[PDB]
Amino acid sequence: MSVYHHILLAVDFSSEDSQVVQKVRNLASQIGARLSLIHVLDTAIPLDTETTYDAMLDVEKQKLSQIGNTLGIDPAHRWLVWGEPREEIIRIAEQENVDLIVVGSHSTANSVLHYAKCDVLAVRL
């Protein structure tokens, strides 16, 4: 039986994403685990200018989707959430029955690591 069943990858959209993506794909396939994906984004509204929240979200959505598409993850298992990375990472992991969180170091990594209720894989970038 599989040593981990459900691996959550956290990506930050750096140029080094691709190393981690292929590694995590090889990982999950060799051990038989399913993958989910999350990226954490990353008060006065300016009145003299057009806001670009939706366009900015679309860029993020595309980057998430580049990665999601490579990994064959259903959009239902791709997460783009507002908030503090550590907290949001850990809340999705709990909610979604993850048993391995994967993060890159380069922080967020060290905070997820100190508060996660499951194993954490920190991948050197």
Report the interface residues with a copy of itself, using CB under 8 A.
Answer: 2-3, 23, 26-27, 30-32, 105, 109-110, 113-114, 116-124
Nearer to Cl ion among residue 39 and residue 78 (C-beta): 39
In angstroms, the CA 89 to CA 40 distance is: 8
Cα 105 vs. chain centroid, distance in angstroms?
A: 13
State yes or no: 40 annotated in a binding site.
yes
Supply the minimum distance, in Å, between the C-beta of residue 20 and a copy of itself.
Answer: 10
Nearer to a copy of itself among residue 34 and residue 63 (C-beta): 34
Q: What is the DSSP string of 7-37?
A: EEEE----TTHHHHHHHHHHHHHHHT-EEEE
Nearer to a copy of itself among residue 20 and residue 40 (C-beta): 20
Helix (H) / strand (E) containing 109: helix 108-115
- Residue 69 binds: one of Cl ion, a copy of itself, none (C-beta under 5 to 8 A by kind): none
State yes or no: 24 annotated in a binding site.
no
Cβ-Cβ contacts under 8 Å for 8 (sequence gap 6 or more): 35, 36, 37, 38, 89, 92, 93, 96, 98, 100, 101, 102
Nearer to a copy of itself among residue 2 and residue 62 (C-beta): 2
Supply the minimum distance, in Å, between the C-beta of residue 37 and a copy of itself.
Answer: 18
Residues annotated within a binding site for AMP: 10, 40, 42, 104, 108
